[PDB]
Amino acid sequence: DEYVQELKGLIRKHIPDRCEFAHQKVTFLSQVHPSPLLTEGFKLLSSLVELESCEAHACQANTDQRFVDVILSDNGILCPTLPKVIPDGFKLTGKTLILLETFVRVNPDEFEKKWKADMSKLLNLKHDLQKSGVTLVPIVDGRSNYNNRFVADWVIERMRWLLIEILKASKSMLEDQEYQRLIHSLSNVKNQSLGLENLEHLKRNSLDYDERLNESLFIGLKGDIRESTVREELIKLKMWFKDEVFSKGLGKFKLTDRRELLESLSSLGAHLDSDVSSCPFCNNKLMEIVYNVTFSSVERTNIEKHYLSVLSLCNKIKGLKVFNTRRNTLLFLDLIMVNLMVDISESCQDAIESLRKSGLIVGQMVMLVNDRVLDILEAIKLIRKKIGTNPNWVKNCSKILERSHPEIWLQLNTLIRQPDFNSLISIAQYLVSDRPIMRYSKICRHKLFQEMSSFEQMRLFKTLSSISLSLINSMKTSFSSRLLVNEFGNVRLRECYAQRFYLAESLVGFLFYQKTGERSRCYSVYLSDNGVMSEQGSFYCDPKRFFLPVFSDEVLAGMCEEMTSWLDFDTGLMNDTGPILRLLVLAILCSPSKRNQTFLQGLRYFLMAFANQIHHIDLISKLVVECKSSSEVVVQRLAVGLFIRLLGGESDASSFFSRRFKYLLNVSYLCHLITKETPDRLTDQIKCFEKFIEPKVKFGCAVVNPSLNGKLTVDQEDIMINGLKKFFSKSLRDTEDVQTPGVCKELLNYCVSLFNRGKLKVSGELKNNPFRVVIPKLDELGNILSTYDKEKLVSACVSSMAERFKTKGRYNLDPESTDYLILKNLTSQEELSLMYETLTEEQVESFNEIKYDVQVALAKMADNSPFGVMKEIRAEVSLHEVKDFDPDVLPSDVYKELCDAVYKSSEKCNFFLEEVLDVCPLGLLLKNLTTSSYMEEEYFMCFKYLLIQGHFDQADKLDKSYFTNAALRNLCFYSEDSPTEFTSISSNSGNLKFGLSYKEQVGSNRELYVGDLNTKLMTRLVEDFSEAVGNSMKYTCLNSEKEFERAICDMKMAVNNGDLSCSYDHSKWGPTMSPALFLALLQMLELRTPVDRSKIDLDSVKSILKWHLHKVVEVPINVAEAYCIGSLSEEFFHQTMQLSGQIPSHIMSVLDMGQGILHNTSDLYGLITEQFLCYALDLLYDVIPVSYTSSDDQITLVKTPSAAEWLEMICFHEFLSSKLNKFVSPKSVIGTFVAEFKSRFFVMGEETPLLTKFVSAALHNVKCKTPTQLSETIDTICDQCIANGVSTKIVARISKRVNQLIRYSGYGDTPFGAIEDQDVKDWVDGSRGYRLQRKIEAIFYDDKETSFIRNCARKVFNDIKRGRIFEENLINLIGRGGDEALTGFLQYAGCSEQEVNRVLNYRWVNLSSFGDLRLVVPTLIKTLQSKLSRSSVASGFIGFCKSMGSKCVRDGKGGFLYIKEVYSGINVCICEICALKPKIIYCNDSLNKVSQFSKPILWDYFSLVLTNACELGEWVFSTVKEPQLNNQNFFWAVKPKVVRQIEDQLGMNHVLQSIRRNYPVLFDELKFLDVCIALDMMNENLGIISHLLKTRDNSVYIVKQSDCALAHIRQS
């Protein structure tokens, strides 16, 4: 009370501005007392922050701070019996209301848990407030500091600084655990490195449950077992094991009996029991269509370009919506297209016959707008129907394309051209062709693929590429795109979407489909040979899994030719295995599924099991998958017939087993061609949760919803402690219970107590001791928007709009500005469609849901006869509105198709309007928003708007002055959710939540738990602890390149030595083990630091693995509704409904181990226990093994004295590893021929190239931002691919494919582009700079126009190098431009201006000159800030091609334009320059109209030669010389051979040289580096320093002899 008089004058510097200040201040001067001074003189800050955040949004300052029931009861509103919660602000006008909260948390640790609990308190309120007749927008002001306006950040930090003595004076003069959280809440902006040392100054109380945790978990652990008693125990255990259960034959491992594996394989995959056909085309519904396409074409235009130009103009004119509804803005340009069709029909004699039938339109068909086939006569109805609706229709709808318009209409007269109907009948009566049929749901004649020549086998892949491109660009159709006609096996197709694909000059194909979107469609493929339509099938498949063959005839044909040319040891076997593998690749491409993907994943385990000498007994029951269709039976017969073809022969058919293993290993990794996108996510989250919970309830530990804050109930306590001592029981001498998840505590004691002595090959030494915004909700991971975000941006839009229209009294909205704010904060009609089409279908329908409930909440805001009984109201309509309670999720399977239309087809009343009314007054959307589907084609959307229309939506207080447990939530900054006093089961804030998601692994989905943010921190603590432990450990490899490379080297020399070298694995490493096991391991670890030779305290790791033992794993909300419809997990959720009927949304268990959560902490366990097993096998079976560990995959390389007669040892190792819940998977294979580790397979004398995984990596993951970045990333992937020595043919064909992917996107071709074809040596010698140098100097095939500029580069390089300076200040000359800098360098190196005249005409046209290709600072600063700071593939490529053909490229003024518009400002400059390479090289005068993009190829070539003088060189200046037999399949290792004449470790030697380059760029956000650091800031196509500070990352290239000896030479 020595500064209590100071506080009357401290807060006296505040004018009583509002009612929240003077009413609090008049009671302040009337009492000098520290007991209300820390509450009522301290809640004024919280009230001021609350009033400021109420002043931020729309709000009424509730000074009473009362309930939600009483805040609805101001006027006459009946009470809906609300849950009793307290808001921090209300704003009620009309029939909507805004609940706004105000909380501030200074750290992100408890910023998100209070936000989640607050928004879950706001989302558990909508289900009872929605039924009252009102929807709310739950907004919150989540903060991290104090940013008020009534104070200005100069007194409120002194409200916690000068007041720090008065609460200590209260605690010294006059509460227990509410004191330290009030200090932790009033902290500053903290640089708070909370390590494990935090947990020391937490409280550590007891619950009388931790004692029984220790009684269940720590009794049998002593850590004091002598070194001789372990030997005397294990020798008696081996004497038990060899005489007991190995001699009676319960071994998990046998001797492969190599004749029998092929018989079990023939019984395994070759479905002779099934009724499938032997023809692959008849059984697959798409190989038949590919066969019918490619064998109707092998045996055998001014109006066309005008029609395609007006088609592109129609595509440009549709995406504006100037016709106020989505119905006439399709039919009007349908009328434009049919008028242009009848105009071209009146142009020439044979025009619609010769150049249209053979081209774009076929018999009774007119191609148009949204790739739509229309079959013309329907328009002859509809336009006539339109003149039934509007007789004087084309009188104002043409002038609205004149005014309020683009105002440039390049149509001839077709706007006002009322079509002559008799002429259209005459043309439509001419085209007499069958209507299209689209088949849903015998004899065979398909010419036997093994017998067909290799010329037409290429045609199958080429037509598969054409049809697959037609599938991939079916996402290019717009995703709203409502048709004109509604709508069972065989449909005579009225009008459909249709992609095209070319085969020759005469014939085009088609691809017909009805539905827009990205999911699996019922496609239908017709050809048109000379205009005749011909049916060739109709398949039902998913398009986005066909990005692999989309331009890769040559790539897949080349890798099949390579993979067949690996078999040059038998000629007839090669010619037999050629077409069967090519058919296999065709079947896998043409039918990408998950089940055949999983089967081909199992084939490498079968190949190792046939390869090695010992394999597990229970793999054949796992290698087989149940074929869902007859399509998977085809590939499962083909691959098994291939394996029996070249493994089981009548002779000794295992002669060259290395090449056979290589070939079959790539047959099994040819799995990877199938796209790992898991065709539906909701049937994959089911399998993820089922894989989560099958061992958990098989063992019996899964519980129902815990309390989420600390405590467990007594029954949960009992089942938890019973699962604990069921986990730890597992006595060492019963040979049964060998698959049950748990650890033998007695042998775990032997393990940790022999680890305490220095007798393992690892030890607990522990050098340098380890003691040193939008967040999702955990109920839904793997999705694109949380339930929070899906109302967070709704809340942002409604809060932004609720102030802007009441500035004057407008009371309306703009129907495009209400589609702009969502479309901004998620990702003026050009302004909408510019970034509307940068989405995915899931994002489109999420945008539609957000537009729905935003327009509902806005329509409710200004709000101040259902007896049309054909069916009953309360039996159908009100029943469906009360069962689901939501008009939003009213399904389409509960009703009929026509009843949605006839309830829509009621007469005109006060619920509708006509004249549309795009002015849209707010609150009159009740009659406006519904009529936007009464005049438009959809019906059920109007049905849901009509259902939401007609109201079918329905002194003690002096002692209690301090903040006690009953006074925790009075303030806004109090932070009740802080880590304050942790129990042995929680952390006083939460209960260690996690989530469920899947990894999208290739064969089987790895599950992946997204942790909560506090749990991310508490996970990273133990993770960094274990990483610093494993740094001292010598046989781990999860982080180290060093020990993984030593494992590689040891593995190579052991397979060369012929040592038996295993390859284990672990079945369910995640879902089996428990953190209680980690407690039982850490209890007796010593970790004696070399600083202080003493057992360190592990209680900072044990008292947080006790929190990971009790983790509240969430469920997906999409599996709590997929198990609510109606399979042992489906039995589990339906047997706990007979229990306590709350939804089982949470699971706490003993055995969890989050995959990737406790990864390295399990790696220390799987190192310590594995070295225990490696020491046991050292003594018991007198070998000297050495074992590595990657925490899921292992290898125990075993030396042998003096054949696999030591099955004893290996079965006993499996038994002991089963007793320590390291359950050896049936995937594990052990023997002296093949040793895998982390999918890198070693054979004697060589290494498997493993081609198809890297080829399928290069053909997939085509990430698309800019083609510079795209061919940066794919050049990196081709570098990684040719590091393994695939060929230079396959990499060149991948280069052709990626260059065609660029060229198909409308970018055209550029001299940088993708890297070139026939690139034979530039991978070893050279980064991307040298390859672009090679591509630019390969345009000049004479090498006369480039030797002069290389001599100029020599003149610059000899001047700039060491020993001399010669104007190192080239900082400013390069940054001016590309033209004048090249002229200055060419005149400083010394020549005339005639060389300037003859060089500076070679000008490539640029597109990323003034900026980048905007399809939503250089790459230098981006790479330096990426260094210094520390969703399918096909639907990304289509969103790339859709946003590149649009308005992307920029000019010098503020604005943008098209790429074809830039390529149209062009001329022809025949004489020796423009015809040197066509549409690549130009004249200076040929680019006269568009000269702002004409940058030189010689300047960029000069920049590349100076860069390849920096990064390497003294040989990049020489002339490319003339190079000059050996075996085709003899590859060998080459060295990168690089002379980088700079000083290394450039991480700091370029950051400090950016002051000399660009000082304000570093401000706001050596001797040789400086000349080639200004060459990279000005352009993008160089990338100089990305291959300087980083390393090559491979530097171990193996290449073939034919791709290295045949390669060129460039000597100095």
Curated annotation (Swiss-Prot):
Q: Name one GO molecular function term.
A: RNA-directed RNA polymerase activity
The UniProt keyword set, sorted, is: Cap snatching, Host cytoplasm, Hydrolase, Magnesium, Manganese, Metal-binding, Nucleotide-binding, Nucleotidyltransferase, RNA-directed RNA polymerase, Transferase, Viral RNA replication, Virion
| Ranges for domain RdRp catalytic | 1049-1224
Record's keyword annotation contains Nucleotide-binding: yes
User: GO cellular component terms?
Assistant: host cell cytoplasm; virion component
Report the co-factor binding details. For endonuclease activity. Binds 2 Mn(2+) ions in the active site. The divalent metal ions are crucial for catalytic activity.
Q: Which cofactor does it need?
A: Mn(2+); Mg(2+)
Major location, coarse class?
virion
Write out the function statement from the record: RNA-dependent RNA polymerase, which is responsible for the replication and transcription of the viral RNA genome using antigenomic RNA as an intermediate. During transcription, synthesizes subgenomic RNAs and assures their capping by a cap-snatching mechanism, which involves the endonuclease activity cleaving the host capped pre-mRNAs. These short capped RNAs are then used as primers for viral transcription. The 3'-end of subgenomic mRNAs molecules are heterogeneous and not polyadenylated.
Tell me more from the record: Classified as His(-) endonuclease since it does not have a histidine upstream of the active site that coordinates the first cation. His(-) endonucleases display very low activity in vitro, although they are clearly active in vivo.
Q: What is this protein called?
A: RNA-directed RNA polymerase L
Q: Which organism is it from?
A: Machupo virus
